[PDB]
Structure 1
């Protein structure tokens, strides 16, 4: 659970865009922990000496209960207001697990969204996560 930081003091995070297929038309979002009626892109803190691609796959297993084929690094995204820096990867989902860590522990929810709808639900509270999809 040890948080890690870049040299400028930003928290290091990693996340995946968890697509249903290689056509990248539908993405899996998970409920906010603070506010369960809102949606976020699953992701979280890198552990010490943990590769960003390893952290990304690990956090989406913990938070979303999915596994799959790791794809490209999309980019590195800062949240200036919250002082964190996130590596965002494509993941093509091949396994959907029941009773995953956050479902059991905090009743976290997950749902497939068409890309345009994911951008819509992220915009108000998570505009940087909406920007993950701009490419």
Structure 2
């Protein structure tokens, strides 16, 4: 896929907080491709002309193998150190698929976390993703 950028050179990305239910108590994290012992929030680059909510849902299907009801935009988060600008949405998961693109292609893993444990495992390498949950 083609990477895209805002006018300031930051990479355009989208991500979703995939909750198990409307109570937003458990969220789905996926393993990192290059470092499978780490967890990240599923998301990725926006394609050219792609709306951010479309990108977010597409990346969650690809990386995490779930579909659901797209909810609110939480916010737009910059990672200054890596020059990323990410739109973060809530998704309420209603469909969990068994054999999804990144599982088959690269052995990506997925796992449910209580919110405070997701924050904990994201903090060391992904502190901006941990901040996605602050509100």
TM-score normalized by structure 2?
0.99
Map Cα deviations across residues 44-102 of structure 1 (whole Å, 9 max, x no partner).
00011100000000000000000000000000001111111000000000000011000
Distance 1:106 1:81 in 2: 27
Question: How many equivalent pairs are there?
Answer: 135
**TM superposition shift of 1:129:** 0.2
Distance 2:82 2:3 in 1: 14
Distance 1:36 1:100 in 2: 17
TM-score normalized by structure 1?
0.99
**TM superposition shift of 1:34:** 1.2
The residue that corresponds to 1:102 in the other structure is: 102
Unaligned runs of 5+ in 2: none
- SS of corresponding position for 2:54: helix
Q: Which aligned runs of 4 or more in structure 1 are off by greater than 3 angstroms?
A: none
CA RMSD of aligned residues (A): 0.4
The residue that corresponds to 1:52 in the other structure is: 52
